[PDB]
Symmetry: D2
Subunit: 240 residues, 4 copies
């Protein structure tokens, strides 16, 4: 049965910023979710200004993978919902965090670090080099993805060392970035993917959308729900 994916987007820039609305008139979430649906996923969206930011228990309980984009309103996501999502990831829900989502409460909580970085908005070139060429996330991608204009993020990226580094970006201005990183938290699989500044049509680039689709598939839950913790009796005789 199709993997069920919820694409969550702060959905502030596209309402109010002319240059962004021109690129994403129905929001970045609509673009990503449309692509995913046309790729066979059961795709829905959620935004910050819906009740419970669209992430009710009912929604999350039928969500296999959550995709997250935020930027200027990270602080408005309520702690109750962050905790709810955190619990679901640890139980096995997948999480794909995009671009400025590195500063989301949920990603910072999972990482345990500041998730800070260097950055510059200069309409500069990015080339995302594949460094895990057999990884399912890079199926169909070529040796790199090139973006003619993006916002630079630069090392040092204050994240725990990834389980795997999939992409490393080169930027025109001299920096590099670990731009595709996987992590596992509990049963959940997380993929950080750097591209997607709101003022560039990055989410219309077919290789970008394909990485996201590939990542949704890679992140799907396997044994969602079942771990026993706590006080336990012995499985073998203990000798006095």
């Amino acid at each position: 049965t199709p993997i069920r994916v919820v694409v969550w987007n702060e959905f502030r820039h596209e309402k109010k910023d002319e240059q962004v609305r021109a690129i994403y008139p129905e929001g970045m979430h609509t673009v990503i979710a449309s692509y995913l649906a046309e790729a066979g996923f059961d795709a829905a969206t959620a935004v910050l200004d819906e009740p419970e930011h669209g992430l009710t228990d009912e929604v999350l309980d039928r969500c296999d993978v959550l995709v997250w984009w935020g930027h200027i309103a990270h602080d408005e996501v309520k702690d109750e919902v962050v905790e709810r999502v955190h619990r679901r990831v640890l139980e096995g829900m997948g999480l794909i965090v995009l671009h400025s989502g590195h500063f989301s409460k949920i990603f910072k909580k999972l990482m345990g670090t500041t998730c800070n970085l260097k950055w510059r908005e200069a309409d500069e070139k990015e080339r995302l080099w594949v460094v895990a060429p057999g990884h399912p996330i890079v199926e169909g991608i070529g040796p790199y993805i090139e973006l003619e204009q993006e916002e630079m993020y630069g090392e040092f990226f204050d994240i725990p060392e990834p389980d795997e580094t999939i992409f490393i970006s080169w930027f025109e201005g001299g920096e590099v970035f670990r731009s595709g990183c996987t992590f596992t938290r509990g049963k959940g699989k997380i993929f950080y993917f750097r591209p997607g500044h709101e003022t560039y049509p990055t989410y219309h680039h077919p290789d970008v959308l394909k990485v996201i689709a590939n990542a949704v598939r890679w992140a799907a839950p396997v044994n969602r729900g079942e771990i026993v913790f706590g006080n336990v009796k012995p499985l073998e005789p203990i000798k006095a």
Copy 2:
């Protein structure tokens, strides 16, 4: 020149349980700090009931490596202080988390997971096998450390995958545990080391103490201090 170490202990059990007090009449912190002093470290102690839990900015700014044990009052450590310690580890302070410190606010914050596990107090044998035989933390340690009595902890331990697993424990009752794990968070080096239940003389065991001393040296800051993040000018010209 000597590495400065603060040994933090909740110090509630040793006052409320006579069986504990008999083993550690001046608390576990005193035993650990005394050994570290004799090993050549500049060692101090701090406990929960001191003001700021003993961890003022003044104390933390002169602390190279913090050692942490807690159990029954993890909740009483104020968030302001957890946040202060978290900042210090990211800037390069070392952290050694011991035994029940797996449920400390600070370790859970740095891990991003629940750090739950299975457990049992049945005075059973533990054998900590070395699985990183060339690691500095196991200098002078044989193939395993054997403790005649300890509290079992058992996988699955809900932690991010370690940078390195140093020890894996075998318990008499059937369980195993990744009982010595290293992580890096920011510039800080963390070592989780399982043994140390308050009802057993585990911190009188010479190999246990040697591991802690080896870990204090390993975890000593390099390049300690603020990392530069934020908006930056290009090092190469960007075609406009």
Copy 3:
């Protein structure tokens, strides 16, 4: 298209030893391949005492995942064949190494270490604890797999640190072992799975066969073939 898997087995013990033949009268390869065929894989088998050990170019070129079991005749696998296999794994072919396969020429070549370990044949109990509970390899597996009789292998196991540790074994006799380990080499995915001594019906255990099937699915290539190396022209202008 179903995944094409070749199950390679030394196939000496099952002819030499009456007690082994009684358990695996047509070889362990036949039992594993039959299960895989029932699970929907396009399964074939190959054995040491065949021209090219059954691993001709034509066979390997259509092999998506190779499963390897050997023990008493690792030396007899011709270097030309080991090299052929090694090239295929780096191009993306999956490799599942079973039990005494740890000392196969192919596994040692891919690892770079001796792959030696401690061992004991004493019909003792082994409990394989899952330590990556979200990993695809453990789909359908409970917290542990228990085998009533197996040969002990024990740490230190001289392997490079795995990409992920999936299983850690507890043995009745006191030892532990990293019993399911993943590695990536080139584009190829490798899984080492410890259980499988010839004198015990381990490959009739449903959980064991399930893990192998899950690992074959996991290890199948999705970007298969030649990577570009060598001298390359610049993508950006270089100032003279």
Copy 4:
């Protein structure tokens, strides 16, 4: 006791090419070893055209860390010597592989991959960004090292995923590289460090030499010696 380091260098280019001899008149090994002696190490050199290539059992037994640079005569290192070195690394001798040492027999043997990569000799700028800012290898190193001219190596670099990535290089021509990588093999610690082309004064750069010195200290053996393997008696009773 100072750490004993042997700097091994093929030493063909500096004898045959006047452009190279002008930069390194007494060989690249001399320059590195002289720095290391001033940094307090007990340093010695060895070269290809000495008996046993300078790497007798006697020499290797008193070597704590071996540094290796080769390029046009990797094939002339005798397999007997490669094997000797390999055994010593597994027992805990450190190994620092420099630049075209990526294609040395010893590095390839420890890695289990081809170690191939993309490359270009175009006198282009390289900026080595630190991505493990607390690591001992980068003590005293700024956010990056910049080399005005170097040979480009580019991803994909066919190595096993490093234990840690210390540096990632940006090159003027558009590529990136994992340019400082640690690995553990047996007891031995290995650091690959990219810079070092023979036609550029790279080993006269203070930060490059500092990194090497730091890596020599980091790679010093602990618990050096034969690991015990083989058949072992049980530590606990095994039931009939």
